[PDB]
Design an enzyme around this catalytic site. Sequence first.
Site, short mmCIF file in Angstrom:
data_model
loop_
_atom_site.label_atom_id
_atom_site.label_comp_id
_atom_site.label_asym_id
_atom_site.label_seq_id
_atom_site.Cartn_x
_atom_site.Cartn_y
_atom_site.Cartn_z
N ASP A 486 0.83 -1.20 0.00
CA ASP A 486 0.00 0.00 0.00
C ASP A 486 0.86 1.26 0.00
O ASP A 486 2.04 1.21 0.39
CB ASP A 486 -0.93 0.02 1.21
CG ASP A 486 -2.12 0.95 1.02
OD1 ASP A 486 -2.31 1.45 -0.11
OD2 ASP A 486 -2.86 1.18 2.00
N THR A 819 -6.96 -0.67 7.36
CA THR A 819 -7.97 -1.70 7.24
C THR A 819 -8.22 -2.04 5.77
O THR A 819 -8.72 -3.12 5.45
CB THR A 819 -9.27 -1.26 7.91
OG1 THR A 819 -9.81 -0.12 7.22
CG2 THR A 819 -9.02 -0.89 9.36
N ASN A 820 -7.86 -1.12 4.87
CA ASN A 820 -7.93 -1.37 3.44
C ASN A 820 -7.10 -2.57 3.03
O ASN A 820 -7.35 -3.18 1.98
CB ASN A 820 -7.33 -0.16 2.74
CG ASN A 820 -8.17 1.06 2.87
OD1 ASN A 820 -9.37 0.99 2.82
ND2 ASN A 820 -7.53 2.15 3.23
#
Length: 1089
Positions: A486, A819-820
């Site tokens: 991410d 949380t993605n």
Amino acid sequence: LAAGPALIANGDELVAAVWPYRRLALLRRLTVLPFAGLLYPAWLGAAAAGEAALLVLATICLAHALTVLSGHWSVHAHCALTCTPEYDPSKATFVKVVPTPNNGSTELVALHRNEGEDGLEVLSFEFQKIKYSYDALEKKQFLPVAFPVGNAFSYYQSNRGFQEDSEIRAAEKKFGSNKAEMVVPDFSELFKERATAPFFVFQVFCVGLWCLDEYWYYSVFTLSMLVAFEASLVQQQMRNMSEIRKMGNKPHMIQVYRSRKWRPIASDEIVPGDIVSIGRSPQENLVPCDVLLLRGRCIVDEAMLTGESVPQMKEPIEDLSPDRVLDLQADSRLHVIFGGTKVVQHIPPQKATTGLKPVDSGCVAYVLRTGFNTSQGKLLRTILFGVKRVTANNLETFIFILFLLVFAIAAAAYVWIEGTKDPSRNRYKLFLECTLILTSVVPPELPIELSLAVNTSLIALAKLYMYCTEPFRIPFAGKVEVCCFDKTGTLTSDSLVVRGVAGLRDGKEVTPVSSIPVETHRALASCHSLMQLDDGTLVGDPLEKAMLTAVDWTLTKDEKVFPRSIKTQGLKIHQRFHFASALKRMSVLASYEKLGSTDLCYIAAVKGAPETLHSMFSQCPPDYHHIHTEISREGARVLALGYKELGHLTHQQAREVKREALECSLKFVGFIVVSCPLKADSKAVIREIQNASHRVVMITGDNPLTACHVAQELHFIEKAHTLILQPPSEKGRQCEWRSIDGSIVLPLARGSPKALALEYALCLTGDGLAHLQATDPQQLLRLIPHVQVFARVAPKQKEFVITSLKELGYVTLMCGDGTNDVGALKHADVGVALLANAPVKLGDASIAAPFTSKLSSIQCICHVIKQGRCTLVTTLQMFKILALNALILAYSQSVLYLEGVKFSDFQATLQGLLLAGCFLFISRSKPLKTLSRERPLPNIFNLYTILTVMLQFFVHFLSLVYLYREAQARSPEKQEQFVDLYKEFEPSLVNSTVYIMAMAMQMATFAINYKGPPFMESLPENKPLVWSLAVSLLAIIGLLLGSSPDFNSQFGLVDIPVEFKLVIAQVLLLDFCLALLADRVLQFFLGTP
């Protein structure tokens, strides 16, 4: 009556097929009828009619135990063994639900029977906490509980609230309560799950066998220790599980409109259909459910879904046409607020409009979905049960045992055949000997040993402040091929830094905010939506927070803004025209006193999208589009600034004459440029990962331009040009590849992605992903491995990308703070959560990831790889050594007993203690600090590992045959064709020679297979191991030498003749040299892929 096979609607995301089963009554179960009804009564009857019977019973008992446990090991076996299918739903009791692929495991759920409102029997079941109801009347099909989604926007305007409780109880029965309770499994359930594990059952069977071998005192102690150890590991798992319970969601008071009155109610009694007030809470309370914004406006930080750290504006549905059908796919971006999202700011409904107003002045919203069906609830479901817990029971371990068992079957068959050639042998002892050979060839320690090795790597990791919840995932860190990252909070900080204002000077140079004109200070200081709370805390949008801090202005409670550093007069804000998504702009009316006059001069300050102010500017610089395009290419967020002095307005006109002209004749006042900076460590760690021959891929929810720029800065893209696949905005053109610059546009071709992925880097957008998923999933699956950047990816699409990578047989690592990443973290082979903003509450990602860093540095990943390669090589090396020892044992155990010689009890005891010591010192070996470019072998099944085990065994075997014959040629001739069975150990020359040789060769086997100069600490650095090998070599030389007969006597060695002593020493040296050469040559010839 009489629902057929496959009772689910086509296109349910969770459940692929549903077949009902009823549990058989206890007496009719196949666990008892064949057991309690046939085999045991015939045995009991033969027993009453008057040792071989008990052995035959024990094998019958063992087969029964495995059949009962097989129902525990497999839900499919459980259904077949204990239940029968029933086509009539009124008589069924249970349903076995098979989820869609990757959506978990098949479960057997009880069917709930409820009386409907009509007195009609409503059959319903709950699978993974979602209720599915059978529609008996219209469709004869199982439907998920229908939420009020996709409805007309007439229903929402007419809803007011409910003035009753019967309908409320009916709604509660239909949809359920919003339960975010984490049910912690009981200690008994986890311990039962562990006690039915195949290895523990095999070990308890072995303990039973030692009890069968008269080890009465020994068997109870060993069993108690085994149970206590497994219980301690379960206690650790319970500790890990108690933190998940510690996360949950606290009950809080929310304003609900019930019985025509507004009341504070606990968030757990909210049901879908309630009208609730949603506002900024002072406790930073999360939104409890998915809600449609009916009235009032809010700025919400939806960090949970887009991963973009930037708050989005939400608009009321009041301004739209009532005939529009709710599309959750289209309208959710603007009109739905999801549960668990944070309301950064809210604007109360205007007092002028007739209708419901809440006491807290929140926005009035209608609840669409509650509990575990929200997007947060979907994430949480994946958190609780979305991947099989990794156990020690790997397919590799089972195949390895089956391989050793084939060889032990051959050895046991040899002992059986020869022991059956001598008719004098008591069949009980021959069966006992064969069973002991079978149970000792397969040592009970292998999984305990592997767990101890993993636990030592866990202790090493704990010293680096990395906690690991699932230790058995560490060997997969040795196998990781693809590292997914991410962007936000992981590689960049969440802290936004304002670089400055561009387009103020001739050229591209961004002028720092300290050197901007006074009009620009006034524009930044007045053009904001910040507000001052009663406590004086400044609240609102992080971009705005950064703007106000960088200009050094302070807002007061009276909406007046005064400078701290600049000798400018303060501004009073009078009216704000908030940012409208339709207008893509915001405007503020402010006034300042003129220098030396009490006259208030009114000014308009405007900010908005560059494309919109371009048409709104009265005088625009010629390079406006060039500057805008180039700054947007740098991945910065750019806002245009407009300024206008309005002069003198009458007090009535200034409030009224504002509506008539919001936007016209704007002056261009520059571009505010905001960047998210890279973390200082990111580039070095990413370079280390790339240098370790790992493929790096970016998967982010952020905008593709900024994500591609940051990926370029991190060298995720080394290629000159990056192509973005855009989906067709209209039905029928093919998708197009567009360069970042727009210079090159290429149509998609069905050709091989290798050619494009050699010259260009490929970035797929979430819209493009969804389009490819709808149009051609096979081309998508072929494309995914060639993509370098995934952008605007939703959490479920992150999961899909990770699972697709796994389906190609890649071992995946995911690193994330959000949380993605939860879906990806759970489904990745190695998920590592970083806490955003390192220096108690645990964000769900720190619970969802198998691994959690207490540091925000990504350097932990380099540590994990360093540790994983060590652990991966250790277990594989242990497996090799153990296999070699087992074959050595298998040949030592029966052929020698067939030749009738044994180790002395003291000899065997000392050998065992030294062996156990060597495995303890080997399992504690440390990794090297540097990541090698070479990769370790990933799998146990390699040509090298088989051929090295075979060739080393063959060398050792030839050595044992040679020395056995030389001992037999030197042992006195025995006037007996047969070896007596339990001869009191007499120290013989044959025993002493074979023992000394076996110990030396087995110690050589330890020394030969430890390999770590690229992967582990070198031999001289593992000092405990060095001491073990030096003491064993000194022991072997002392035992072979005979300078003192008394010392040999405590060890029970016979004085070896000097001529034979020389032959033994030369052959043992040759054996060591040849086995070393064999291993090193085979490594040189077959290693690496």
